[PDB]
């Protein structure tokens, strides 16, 4: 897997934009330049509503609109 | 290209190793399947331990969830540092002479290979079940701890989706029928995940505190201050409801009304900068410093056998 032997990690198309997108196999879907993505799934997060206790990541709850928070399950 | 310690390993070669380990240490090291996951692969348990009479154990798994890397890790060094330490260090041969360690590499493998060639933040088992077309279940919301009442996700949509029913995923039930058969020798259960650095103890299923609640507290206290002997890592601690968050249907709650009075979640480096993207060149400082934390739970355990 030379995609993960890099230091990266394969995603979906429709989670890894464009600018984001490598070359390298080992990947069935595509392999992506992680460090690059930004928003609450890109760091591993799942919106979900406000009132859902969790352990937040505040810096991405913005990404997540209305109503919704980042969270990451652990 | 072959396996590495301080590397992270495809599942092909953490199997292939789980074999050698057992054939390079037969005193030491024997091998177990103790199940079959959703798509039909092998899961295989590692006992660690010199042959005995009656031998206590301590029940450790790594890779519940699929994109904690650093936990699979943690249980293959773990292997080879027991190992290679024993006769060496009087510490861990007394406890590899007294007590059995049951280590589990990777519960969650069809996760675990699906982040690895398709989906880096996959989460939970791939299992279908009748009823909806979404994927997978959360291993630890889907024991008979509180199960799916607090802190899980009914939506099986959800990262946190608690299953149709407690041990419906062919994985848990498989765990927990490994540990019921077990009871009677099995003294501590240690679950590892990352990330956040962490140590829990129950309850994660309600904010009620275990009858051992203040030796726990102690006693995690007591670890992370020697886990942060080494490199400094800092690690909070506390029971899980109010410490990580709600979450019911935990292995770690499960087994500890089973009757395992020591039962612990480990959750790994870092604090969010890479997050379930730790890199390799930080897994030998963090199994380093989460060996030692395990070996004085094993010793703190071996004093106090029940
Ligand atoms: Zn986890």
Known sequence: ?74 | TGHSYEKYNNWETIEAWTQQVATENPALISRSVIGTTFEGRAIYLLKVGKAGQNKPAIFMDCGFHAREWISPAFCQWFVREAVRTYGREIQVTELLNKLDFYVLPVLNIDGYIYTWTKSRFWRKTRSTHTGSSCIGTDPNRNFDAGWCEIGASRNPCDETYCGPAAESEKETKALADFIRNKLSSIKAYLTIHSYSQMMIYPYSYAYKLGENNAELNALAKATVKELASLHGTKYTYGPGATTIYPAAGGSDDWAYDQGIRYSFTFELRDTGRYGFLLPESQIRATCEETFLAIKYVASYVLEHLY
């Open chain 1, 1 to 74: 897997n030379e995609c993960v032997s890099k230091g990266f990690g394969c995603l979906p198309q429709s989670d890894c934009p464009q600018e984001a997108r490598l070359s390298y196999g080992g990947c069935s879907t595509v392999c992506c330049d992680l460090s690059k993505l930004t928003g609450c799934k890109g760091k591993g997060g799942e919106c979900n509503p406000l009132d859902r206790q969790c352990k937040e990541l505040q810096a991405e709850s913005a990404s997540c609109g209305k109503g919704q928070k980042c969270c990451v399950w652990l």
